[PDB]
Amino acid sequence: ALEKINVADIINGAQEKCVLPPMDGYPHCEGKIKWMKDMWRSDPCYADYGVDGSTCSFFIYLSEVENWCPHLPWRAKNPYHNSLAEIRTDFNILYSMMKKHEEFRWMRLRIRRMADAWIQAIKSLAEKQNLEKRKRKKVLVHLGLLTLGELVQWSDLITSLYLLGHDIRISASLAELKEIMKGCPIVELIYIDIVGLAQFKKTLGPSWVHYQCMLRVLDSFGTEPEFNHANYAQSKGHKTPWGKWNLNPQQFYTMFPHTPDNSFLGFVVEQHLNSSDIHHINEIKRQNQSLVYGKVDSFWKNKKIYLDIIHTYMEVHATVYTKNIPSYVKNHGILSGRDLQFLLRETKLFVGLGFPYEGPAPLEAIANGCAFLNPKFNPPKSSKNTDFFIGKPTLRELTSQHPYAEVFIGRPHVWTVDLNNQEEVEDAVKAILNQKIEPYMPYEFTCEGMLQRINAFIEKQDFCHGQVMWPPLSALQVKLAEPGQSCKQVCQESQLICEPSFFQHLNKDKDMLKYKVTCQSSELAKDILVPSFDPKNKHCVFQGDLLLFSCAGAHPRHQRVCPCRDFIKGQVALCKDCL
Template sequence: VRDGTSSQCEVPRDPRYPDCASKVDWMRARWTSDPCYAFYGVDGSDCSFLIYLSEVEWFCPPLAWRNYSTTPAALKSSAKRQAAFRTDLGALLDQVGTGKESLSFMKRRIRRLAAQWATAAQRLDLKLRRRWREQKKILVHVGFLTEESGDVFSPKVLKGGPLGEMVQWADILTALYVLGHNLKISVSVKELQGFLGVPPGRGSCPLTGPLPFDLIYTDYHGLQQMKQHMGLSLKKHKCHIRVIDTFGTEPAYNHEEYATLHGYRTNWGYWNLNTRQYMTMFPHTPDNSFMGFVSEELNQTEKHNIQQNKVKNMAVVYGKEASMWKGKEKFLEILHRYMEVHGTVYYETQRPPEVPAFVKNHGLLPQQDLQQLLRKAKLFIGFGFPYEGPAPLEAIANGCIFLQPKFRPPHSSLNHEFFRGKPTSREVSSQHPYAEQYIGRPHVMTVDYNNSAEFETAVHEIMRMK
């Protein structure tokens, strides 16, 4: 062993380190269970165990005969750098990478909104009067896009699946980049390990050095992967993590002991974070933080052109997968009496049988073309799913009225399969409660679709609106 004789390596009895002896016993029996111990110099001797447990982990006291006078370069604090706004997104697009349809979707969104991001950056720079801001080192690990989590979203991008999460992640990446932070992006466990300095092995040991980031943005999949590969370091660095969590996490589900004792334990949750570290798509609750996404801004000329070109009896259905149209014939028939109904439903060769013959189906449209369709339409109508996505706000921004179903009773993890297992008991009163509560009439109308008279009255009212 590096230095040290057996007499210098007796297990110390120090009340400040009560777990030292039991940890040495554990190492004697199990040090070969993970190659990471050998990576840190453990060789089966008590000296190597004590060096490891005092210098890599923190269960034993520092050894008097070890030389601690030199400070490793990694521990020297680096000088703070100023964050400068960026308006050219080329380097970000290169960083996002290729090889997944989901990444291509995110890059298309970043490109499409590039000019608006540049304008927003210049505006904020003036508002802040060019004040000094610290450049943060930030890792963004998009766990749900990793192969290890199943990457369920990439195959759905071209088949009409919900894209709300990808919209939000594209906007988070762009916002952090435009604000001038030092950004690293990871969409695989291998990249995550490399960025964090994970030692080779099975994840039992801490990181090889200090955490190289001020902040880590991830999701529940990424959090699970970090737990698997960071060992004790995750607990040590928890406060640096921000979890992008669409529907939110309530305190009862976050507190491990409470969740276990009171039946709130789910596949997610129970991480014992500060609940403000969970960041949601919409501001559901003061328990969590609100991250959001961006909605396009139209200038006065665009707004005027949209109003001039609106087709008064044109409706677009919010639902790109054929399965979303099942059982919706009754109220679609009512809508068809008054309006021309358009769909953007994915199909390969044959028109989906779930889509009625009177619907003009454009197939799955690129985002730019969908925007043009929304700019012509008067009505954007939801079927109840997907919940709380960005599309209704984009439709409203393009001058549409959003018509959506009221849920009686409200949907929640207690009565609805989609929410089952999610770390919240929040009751969702409509497809988009935020639009219902904070935007409301005349831009948003929420009605009971099971009540034909109420639905038809709403359509009448929409037809009369200027």
């Protein structure tokens, strides 16, 4: 109400024609000014803000109210409340929220185990980083899952939101969701899973789209733009019922940083050994023994030749819940987290069999000083060729059993080898026996690293207030992908990551000239594979449907114009200027 009076006051003192500034960072401003010339009477709210038909009034409305146009210094900034978030160092409020429904018992038990580690981490982050003056956000979390990787991630996200001081409302039923949920521009963010999102749409019906900018959707395997755009997915013949939400794809939150079109949420790799356990393990030398990754004996089918090669150099151990198990294997059965990590500390090699795909267990092994033998996949596995991935709303390809371990950890902790190739396996086992490796845990999978990441998303990632401005455009590094290469690939092989919020700044002739791409001619297509550049004719094809901007996808004929950003080593979700 007073924001309307505030903007009207600015317009009352403004010239007829704003001398418009440079549009850098705001590529939709001019198109929306033109839209206002035709449409500022279609809704009385624009006039309620003081819009009077002058183009300067359009500009003022679009910058000050909707943030689609650059901000001008209309008013001075006054160099001088209760609304601030304070970090929490006590869990009783969170437990009392979860003590209402009973499949929260597993999560409460995990949080109680990890409580001291979480509290040390939030205190440590606040001692290193300036966390003052953050606004307390009102957050809804709806766990459709409740109506194991999924549970761990939910637990650590909820814990992180809580430790950072935000006001959380937890919903775990349709009835709870319905009661809670009862331009021109209560709850500010809504964390939800894929099951819960379907429930959200049904509870709200067609008006759900008014809340969609607030959604952060936990989606372990990721959703690519080709599948997120419902009409495009249909035009490609995709039969999967998944995807089709038409969200900004950065609103999907993944388990590992494998899909740069999405955001990486992750989780914490729990530490089960306390200081007494650790001191007792410095007692005992790590043995020349291996431990096979895989709890179900059916995972071991046809792995005998591979294990025999390992068995030539090392004892072979297992934790199996026994047809396919060689008789020389020492089976411990299922172990507690503490007993498992004791075993990992006496173990030189954690042996992947090819399945399961990208879980936490290899990171747990590496964090206890084991090397991981990581089977390589050629062809890479994807929804195109692997029954286990049928219906996934993404063509993402796995190049090994644990692509994160392959790409972001690597040797000497991770030896990515063809398990069928005896020479490659032997070369790895021999080098692992004679190598010095220390326990290693990527910062992003620690309590403190997860808090830093989630804090940055809460403070900086915003889809509800017009122009996306984070990561900052200063971080953009433009690369040309060759034909047959995706934008995801061309950033990754240069130790960068694709940043999909930057595509919109690379989508016309004038913008392309900033990066020494000169288009003699140009056209518009609605295609995930553009902006594209034909270097023979210097013909550019730009994006005609902004929801199809896509890090994934290789152009068969032309070069792709690809927006990369730097990432902080060990914190891939953030650029150095992202905070």
